[PDB]
Every structure is written in structure tokens, then in C-alpha cells.
Write a protein that binds this ligand. Sequence first.
Ligand SMILES: CNc1nc2c(CC[C@H]3O[C@@H](OC)[C@H](O)[C@@H]3OC)c3nc(N)[nH]c(=O)c3cc2[nH]1
Ligand SMILES: CNc1nc2c(CC[C@H]3O[C@@H](OC)[C@H](O)[C@@H]3OC)c3nc(N)[nH]c(=O)c3cc2[nH]1
Ligand SMILES: [Zn+2]
Ligand SMILES: [Zn+2]
Lengths: 352, 352
Amino acid sequence: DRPRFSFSIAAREGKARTGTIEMKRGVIRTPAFMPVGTAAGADIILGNTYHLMLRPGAERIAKLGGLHSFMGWDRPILTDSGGYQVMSLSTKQSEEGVTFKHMLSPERSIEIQHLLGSDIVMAFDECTPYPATPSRAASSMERSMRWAKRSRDAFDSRKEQAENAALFGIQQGSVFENLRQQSADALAEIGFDGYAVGGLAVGEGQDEMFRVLDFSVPMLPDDKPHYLMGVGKPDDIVGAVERGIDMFDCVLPTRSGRNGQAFTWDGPINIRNARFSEDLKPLDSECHCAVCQKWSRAYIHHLIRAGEILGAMLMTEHNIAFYQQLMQKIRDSISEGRFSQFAQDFRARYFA
Amino acid sequence: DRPRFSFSIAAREGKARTGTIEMKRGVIRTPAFMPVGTAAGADIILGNTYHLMLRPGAERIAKLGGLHSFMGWDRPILTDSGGYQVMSLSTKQSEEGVTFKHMLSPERSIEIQHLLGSDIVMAFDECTPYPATPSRAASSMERSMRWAKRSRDAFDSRKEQAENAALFGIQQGSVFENLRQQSADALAEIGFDGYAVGGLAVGEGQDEMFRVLDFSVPMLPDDKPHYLMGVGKPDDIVGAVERGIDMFDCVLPTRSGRNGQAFTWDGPINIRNARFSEDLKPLDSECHCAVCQKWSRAYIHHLIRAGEILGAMLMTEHNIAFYQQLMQKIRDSISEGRFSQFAQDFRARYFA
Ligand SMILES: CNc1nc2c(CC[C@H]3O[C@@H](OC)[C@H](O)[C@@H]3OC)c3nc(N)[nH]c(=O)c3cc2[nH]1
Ligand SMILES: CNc1nc2c(CC[C@H]3O[C@@H](OC)[C@H](O)[C@@H]3OC)c3nc(N)[nH]c(=O)c3cc2[nH]1
Ligand SMILES: [Zn+2]
Ligand SMILES: [Zn+2]
């Protein structure tokens, strides 16, 4: 019988790691990509806390048997704490939490995630806007750390949650090394099952994001998983793995899939472009997905140009599969000690 | 090795028949429902002649290897002749054909269908508007019969087509028994592989459509398949089979699937309605489709209300599967001599 939570590192290359997270509902191979659950293989999917709390509401999801039953997915599910989305899509902040057009607090966030039944629960934090002054970044991070402790206590007070789920803390501090360190120290003192790097993929760009990861990831406990929230493009994922990240989520595969963009080893392509109208090659030359086994760029181009939902579905299936093949290649290369070479080869071809 | 075309009737009950059409690319079980090819089991699918001739053009489809290669479907394909769609969606009529914003003639229609590579080719006809006066219905039908002969000759002049495909003639005559008879006589004199009842499902309503079928279908050769163009709702299909129809096509399963409507044995439902928000039953209680095996009305309701493409896809998959289960039940009941009872039971429950 699998444990509630156990992370094991099987192999390393530089800062990169590959291994497994064992949970009651399944094993998660790392580095992992975690796709949106409602998108359409993956070891864990995402539940959309913000949407679900509004429609149909967390209490209603619980009445229906929880997210696993509702979505027909019996493996692990990760949920965010909801605040990022409230601040992005809705607001009034206070030490208690956020009110918006209801009150979302650390305690309420944890309870919502309990009612949804997720396996990996995120602490309720504040994703500091970018750019931020040192003072504002510090005040924001300090509040997030107080909220992390409140999240910890709320999670621990719910027996079913404490015994069956896992809780990740989220590091903040914007782009400032000293604040990232204080945040890491605060989170480690509280103690979490995993640690996320928050506050990135918010407009800073890849060079700056990588610079922040360079010093931020080593601050987190080495023996726990590291989750980079909101990342990202394939090249962002590769560089983040090079910097010690184990888990990823991004809206790109689905957003791109619904908007004519396909990921390939030769970079992204816009399938609507006329240059694909007579292209009999599959979306990607090496991809093993069902779409690439059967249909051409020309046919998918045709479907999308005709407004056929089948086209968007095939694009999305391909993009999700591409991301999973990327993660498999990353895991295999780290395990074989050839990840550095893989990263180099990947970049040379993707950006050719 | 299968013949070019062979229709065999295995069993009858009243005017209803069940059997098979054998063609080089496969066997078609009748009564048959023929779904849109780009929708997402079926023995034959439809190619959209009108759309294809505009985007990317029939010549381009031929360059890409024909529709079978293009769509990844190696079984039979049926194509319409294009005029119905031109008159519905675009016009100037003449004895030569129709010009619209190009000229579509019987000869050009047959050539387009040849370039697409379809297995069942429809004659180029005029679908008379409804209502029509006797004079206008007669003039229209007479032109369609001249065009049927031209279609026959064009098809026969193309070796690959004549030897590998089949040609159906289309009966016209509006709602008038004498014109339907003249049309049937003209088509039988020319000689076709199958016979369609055209000019219906154009606003006349079920009672009138059934009245016209009552006298029109017996006018067609008994030993050839009968295709009712544009029909229809499940109850229309059942009543048409009771009147001797063997083949069907309809935009309903896909249009409904993309617009929140699901077909069930208890009638259609609009899954967006709030009454489904907590309904844990599958879309239909008896349906064997993949969707009903796995997901609830509540989840599909959620997906569609959230604007998720997955929702529309699941609805469409279910509707297509429902239609195929309907046709299987029809075939089985005729073969077992219990179709009358099936039709009665079907109606009692569908309209309860
Ligand atoms: C895009 N960049 C980005 N996203 C971010 C998210 C949302 C991820 C969440 O976004 C949802 O997708 C819309 C996913 O559900 C995911 O949750 C698992 C963040 N969430 C929290 N709690 N804290 C952060 O610092 C944070 C930073 C982010 N940067
Ligand atoms: C809706 N009612 C209806 N449709 C009709 C169609 C289009 C079927 C065609 O419609 C396309 O779907 C948009 C399908 O491709 C199908 O072709 C196989 C007809 N086509 C011809 N040639 N002649 C007729 O008398 C006719 C009557 C119809 N009544
Ligand atoms: Zn693929
Ligand atoms: Zn079903």
C-alpha cells in the first residue's frame, strides 16, 4: 500500500533530478508536467479551484462525490489555493484574506480544497505583482508566510485531509535573493511536503526567471519536490529542470491547442497558416501521439480553418502528448546521465 | 473480393427492409445512418462536397490523394452533388447548371466527386423549394431528370469512377404523386445503383413528409437501396424505415452536440439546463458509448457551461453513438420480425 506522500530521487545530473512521488492514488514520475484536467500519459492532473468554487461551488462538488468521482479520474489531483486567480480574474486585500466580486482566506482555501478532494493542496499565498519594490515585495512575502502557517494549521485540523493529502508551501519574495531566502527559511520552519516557487511567470521574462531560479531553488529543501508555478513553454521547462525543478503546470498546451498553435521538436507552428494546406507530414515528425499516427498537417489545417471542433481537439491532444513526451525524454536523459546533451540538442533544434 | 456495388435484402417486415450494400471499400449495413466525416460504428461517412469544392478545392484534394487519404478513412464515403448547398448557402440557374458567388453543372459535379474519390456519387439535381406550385414542381423535376441523364453519362465516361464507384439518382416532384411517379419512371429508365428521395426535409413537416413517402418509395425499384436525403430526427428515421427507406443523413447529431442537445431514449435533453447540474446519471441510461460508460450528465453540463471544448466533443460522440445504436436496434428488430413492436415501444418512451 502506497504512503500518503513519499518523494524519492532516483538519479541526478547537475541540479537536475529525476524520481517519483508516491501517494495513495498513484505514483508521479518527476520531472512531471501536470495538465489541466478538463483538457481532454499524465500521472496527475489539475483541478481549477477558482472556477470550481464559483461553479458549481465546492460544497456542491463534495455532494457529487468529490473531483475524482466528478471528473472520472482516480489518480492524483493538484489544486491551487485560488488567490492567484482571484487577483488575476476578479478585490480587497486584508490580513484575513481576499474579498472579491465572498471572502477567501487561508482557512477557507484549505477547506475548499478539502471539499474538492484534491491530493496535493497548495498553501494560500499572495503572488506578488511584477515588478515590485523591495518594500512591497517584503511586505507581501511576510503576509504570505503568515498565511502559510495558517494554511498548515487548517490542513492539519482536518483528519481526512491530513492523513490522505499533501500540502505544499509557496516561496515568494519577487526577484530579491534576501527575501527568497527569508521565505524559504519560513516555509522550512513550518514544514511542508513539497515546495513551490511562486511569484514567477508573471511578466519577468526567461532570463530574469532563470536568474531568480539560480539562487532560489537551492534554498528549498533538497529532499522535497520543487514545483515552479505557471511554467511554461518547452524551453522554460528544460531550463527550469536544469535548475532543480521537479513539477510544472502551464495553460499553453490547451490555450495553444484551441488557438491553432502546435508544439513540435522544431518549435511551435501555427497550423492555420496557408503553408500547411498541402503538408502531408504529421504535426511532428517523431511524435507518437494518436493524432500524428493518423492525420496530416493538411487535414488538421483544414478542420481548424473550417471551424470544426474536431480540429481543436486533435491539436490539444497532440500538444498534451508532446509535453508528456518532453517530460519522458527529460526523465530518461537525467537517468542516463545525458540530460546536458539533451538540453543542448533540444535547444539547437527547437530554435533552428 | 467485394463487387463494385451489390445490395442484398436479408429480411423484411411490412415495407421495412434490412440488408447489406457491398462495395470495394466495405460493407454497409442497412438501414444505415451516415454521419458527417469531420464530426469526430458507422459503415460509411459523408464528404462535404460544397465546402470541399471551395476549400481547398477538388483538384487540391485529388493532389493530396483523395478524401480517403486526406481524412484517414478507408471505408466508403458518400458525397452530395453540391447544388442543394449552393442554393441554400450562396445564384443564377440555367439549363446548363448553377452559377454562384463559378458554374456547377451535372458534368462538373460528377468530376468534383471523382476528384474527391467518393464511393457513392449523387446525381446533380435541383431540390425544389417548398411549397411549390404544380407547374413549378413539374418544371423543376423535368430539369432534374435531364440533369440525371447528364450525370449518368458523365459518370460513365470516367473509367475509374464507373468501375469503382456507384451512382444514385434523386427523385423530385415536391409533394405531388403524379410528378413523383414521372420522376421515378425517368430515373429507372436511365438506371442507377441506388435511388434517393429528394425534395423533402425542406420545411414540410413530418405528417406531410410521411404522406409523400407513403406513395413515393414504392415507385422506386424495390431491389435497390432507397436514400432519404436530409432526414432526420430519430422519430423521422423510424417512420421512414417503416416506409421503405434504407439510408439516412442528418446534421442533427453534430449540430445538437455542439449546441447542448443530447439524444436519449427518453427524448432529447438540453444538458445546459440547471436540472442537470447535480444529475449523476449518464446522458442515457442504456447507451453503450464511451461517454456514458464514464461520465455523468452533471460533468458534461459543467464542461459545456464552462465553454470547454471537451464538453462539445463528448456530446457529439454520444449523439453519433446514439444514432448508430438506433440503427442497430432497427436492423435487429426487422431481422427478428419485431420492428413494428420496436417502433411502437420507441415512440411511447421517446415522447413520454
Ligand atoms: C501563469 N503564471 C503563473 N501562474 C501562477 C499561479 C497559478 C497556478 C494555477 O494557474 C491555474 O491555471 C490557470 C492552474 O490551475 C494552476 O494551479 C495548479 C500561482 N499560484 C499561486 N498560488 N501562487 C503563485 O505565486 C503563482 C504564480 C503563478 N504564475
Ligand atoms: C436538411 N434537409 C435536406 N437536405 C437535403 C439535401 C442535402 C443533403 C446533404 O446535406 C449535407 O449536409 C449539410 C450532407 O453532406 C448531405 O449530402 C450527403 C439534398 N441534396 C440533394 N442533392 N437533393 C435534395 O433533394 C436534397 C434534399 C435535402 N433536404
Ligand atoms: Zn502528435
Ligand atoms: Zn452515450
